[PDB]
């Protein structure tokens, strides 16, 4: 009955928050005498290692699920591949607590890995809402050439052509491309000024310099920005009036602890309702044996609903990303963020703050500018 549940953080105080939420989990509508013992190891300094605690300590203590932040610095290439894939052997379900790297969405390889925080490509869908907030048809799609970027392309190209809206250009980028000036002159060829933006900080920042450099920033030139570009120097070269995005409760990770423990506790009680509960192996030696209830863990976690999360309804997508996460949509205006857009997930709530369109005024522009020049 005792379910050991992992937690990979930077602190041990929020590991204690897991311990106390595990206490609540034994309390709140969950029945077991000792159906939980707490297991929690912080993020490791060597991202090589990443399985010492897991096999030697967690799987040896038969941990069923682990709850992991980005990293203890959260900002290098220490996006958590190695612990995940060491849990990717034998169908061990893991919830990415905060993650938005939709590389981890790739369920062909990311077998047992679902996210409380939906990645950037879900943000793709949100722009469609604003399409119909602002009646657009001439479309500039700008993709740093990424598996996440191309998966976001997939979401975009679907959610376009489902309603048969048609993109003009998807220009495509490596990171570090600074001679985008050719692609920028390509961008000078259009009716459209609907500038839909996806890269890291620095690509964006140099492009803001170069495009501002073109001149290319005037009302109409609407900068539709991914949140990697809502950090660092992409902050610091972008003009003003620019829409940015925010997931509401993307960072209350204490609320993420509370929600995740309530979810996983009542999902454990759904597991104890099931029959033939296969055993967690202790050793990562001699145990060549996949969880048979691996896919049954997946059927538990996909079919369990939790409207009672602190962040709202902890109720996921088909991809295991929470449905109807609250959005707030922002405007650097004198580089001072001006909230306008708010979503339950889909319900359009423009704040009474006006959108200075990110060159000129507060008037809804046109990417519709004819040439009368017929090739």
């Amino acid at each position: 009955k005792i379910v050991n549940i992992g937690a990979v953080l930077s602190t041990r105080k929020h590991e204690q928050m897991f311990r106390e939420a595990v206490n609540q989990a034994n309390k709140r509508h969950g029945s077991w005498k000792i159906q939980l013992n707490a297991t929690s190891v912080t993020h490791k300094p060597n991202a090589i290692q990443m399985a010492l605690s897991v096999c030697e300590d967690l799987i040896s203590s038969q941990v069923y699920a682990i709850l992991v932040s980005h990293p203890p610095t959260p900002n290098d290439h220490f996006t958590p591949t190695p612990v995940s894939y060491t849990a990717g052997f034998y169908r061990i379900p893991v919830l990415g607590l905060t993650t938005r790297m939709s590389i981890y969405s790739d369920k062909s390889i990311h077998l047992s890995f679902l996210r409380t925080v939906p990645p950037y490509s879900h943000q793709s869908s949100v722009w469609f809402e604003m399409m119909r907030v602002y009646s657009w048809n001439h479309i500039i799609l700008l993709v740093s050439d990424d598996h996440e970027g191309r998966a976001a392309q997939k979401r975009l190209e679907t959610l376009l052509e489902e309603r048969e809206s048609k993109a003009e250009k998807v220009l495509q980028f490596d990171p570090g491309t600074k001679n985008v000036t050719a692609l920028l002159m390509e961008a000078k060829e259009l009716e459209a000024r609907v500038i839909i933006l996806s890269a890291s900080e620095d690509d964006a920042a140099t492009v803001y310099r170069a495009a501002a450099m073109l001149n290319m920033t005037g009302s109409g030139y609407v900068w539709l920005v991914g949140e990697r570009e809502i950090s660092g120097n992409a902050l610091r070269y972008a003009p003003d009036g620019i829409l940015g995005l925010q997931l509401i409760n993307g960072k209350n990770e204490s609320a993420h602890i509370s929600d995740a423990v309530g979810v996983v506790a009542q999902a454990v009680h759904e597991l104890l309702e099931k029959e033939n509960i296969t055993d967690p192996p202790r050793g990562c030696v001699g145990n060549t044996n996949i969880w048979k209830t691996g896919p049954l863990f997946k059927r538990v976690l996909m079919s369990s609903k939790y409207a009672d999360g602190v962040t709202g309804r902890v109720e996921f997508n088909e991809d295991g990303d929470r449905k109807f996460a609250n959005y707030s949509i922002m405007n650097l205006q004198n580089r001072k963020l001006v909230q306008v857009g708010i979503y339950n997930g889909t319900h359009v709530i423009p704040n009474d703050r006006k959108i200075i369109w990110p060159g000129g005024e507060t008037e809804k522009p046109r990417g519709y500018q004819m040439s009368t020049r017929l090739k």
Partner: protein, 50 residues
């Protein structure tokens, strides 16, 4: 690529549409002289309009 004199029905129509429609017309010759159909490129599958 020499710009060369052109004559015809369609010119008359385009000037009618310059009148009724207020456009300018950027008029070129085909390198192919052909419509160009979906035909496969090398790798022998790439069915592309030519």
């Amino acid at each position: 690529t020499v710009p060369q004199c052109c004559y015809g029905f369609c010119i008359d129509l385009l000037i009618k549409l310059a009148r009724t429609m207020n456009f300018t017309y950027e008029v070129h010759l085909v390198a192919d002289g052909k419509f160009g159909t979906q035909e496969r490129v090398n790798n022998s599958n790439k069915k592309e309009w030519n």
